[PDB]
Amino acid sequence: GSHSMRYFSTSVSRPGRGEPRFIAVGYVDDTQFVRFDSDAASQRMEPRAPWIEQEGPEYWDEETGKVKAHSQTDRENLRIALRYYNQSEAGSHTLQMMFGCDVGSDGRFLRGYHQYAYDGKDYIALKEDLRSWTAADMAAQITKRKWEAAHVAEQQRAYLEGTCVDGLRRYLENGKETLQRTDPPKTHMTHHPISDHEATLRCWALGFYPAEITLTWQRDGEDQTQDTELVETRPAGDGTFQKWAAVVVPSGEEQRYTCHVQHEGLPKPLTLRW
Amino acid sequence: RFPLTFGWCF
């Protein structure tokens, strides 16, 4: 279907407690496939999905080298941030990074991303055109100029349109059996009385992949927000996702409320009624 | 597949 690959890294300085904690993860759509943790024993990029274990030693050696190199880059970036923001060498700080590519249903390139955040605030982000940057502030402005003079945008662009797409397409094929299927939500509704004149209706969606889903309560066919709760989509731990939405109703009016469920694995949106 | 980030210095 339509698809993405993403990498995330988080560096956390811990002055006096040693070098920064570094943790990186790779995703294809909503499926994690690799990880690296600077505090782990192996000091290796490690598999997190079975289809990535098809790759041979040369892959693992290469990805390990490149991820370790990146941990060193971002460690240095923690250092440089201290000087730009004029901060004490004693603080603990956080640097976060994300990049990736989207491809169409037959593997055509659609989009690339590259972004940094410092202490949870945007720092620098490659623009949609993949040839320039949005600097969040004056610090990131210096980085932007530095990246322009060296041709960082070109080298990021070529990665996003080339290696990123090529890898994504390959992972999709090797992991077709699981990455290329949707799990439509299994749905049901529950009824609980809260008093003698009120009940709770809860709409459930379980066992779905991917995570994107919408759940909507209507009363007489009209969107209802009052007296509802809606939890954040949540992982089951087994690769699939869970969600629910609840509405308070007066006893004897249950038949007036409807729950709608939308998910790519559903040909037509579902409707549940008590 | 991870990129090279040698140039991504702030």
């Epitope: 390990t64 370790k68 240095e76 070529a158 | 210095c9």
Partner: T-cell receptor, first 114, second 116 residues
Amino acid sequence: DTEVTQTPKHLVMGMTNKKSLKCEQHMGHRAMYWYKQKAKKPPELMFVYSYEKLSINESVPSRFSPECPNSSLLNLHLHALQPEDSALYLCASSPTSGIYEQYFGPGTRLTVTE
Amino acid sequence: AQSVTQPDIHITVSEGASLELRCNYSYGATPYLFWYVQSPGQGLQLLLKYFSGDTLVQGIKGFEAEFKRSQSSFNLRKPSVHWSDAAEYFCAVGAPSGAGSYQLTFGKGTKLSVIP
């Protein structure tokens, strides 16, 4: 000066001797390399140092003993070699950030004889 | 992992004619790319490097190079070769080692003979 310097430029050794190659670099670089080169072959990496720490050892026999006194200097101490160790010993330097590149020294021309 | 191939170990040109020296690499990303030249006595001199952006690079000694992504090639070119260009030539890739610190991997080299 974008120049890595090596001494001695030429060296002759028996199989008993101890000698030291010295390499120096003023570019502010934090990565330095030792290579060995035989005739008709490309440079073969022996050692990488990052931040005065040994990062890569390409199974270098113990008769070569590397040292990093500071970010500017790299030494190679030579002890009880064989004739087959005769080679061009190239020192090199590189940045650890920005645009990757390696600057080579002129090399030490080493002859070990029986 | 990262290997570099110079398919032609030995090339001969007549002085004043043009030169192409072939180089291919094999790596899961786009590395840094280089051509070095070495005379018999000396160490290695950098000719040109690719980081880069534009596929056509300009170097010293009248040398240029073309990066071809679909090929993974980085071929050394020179319009009109001088007799003194006769030397050893090495392309190289720069990329992370297993330890994450960067390193050069050389091709086996190309001997250039020029007929003066």
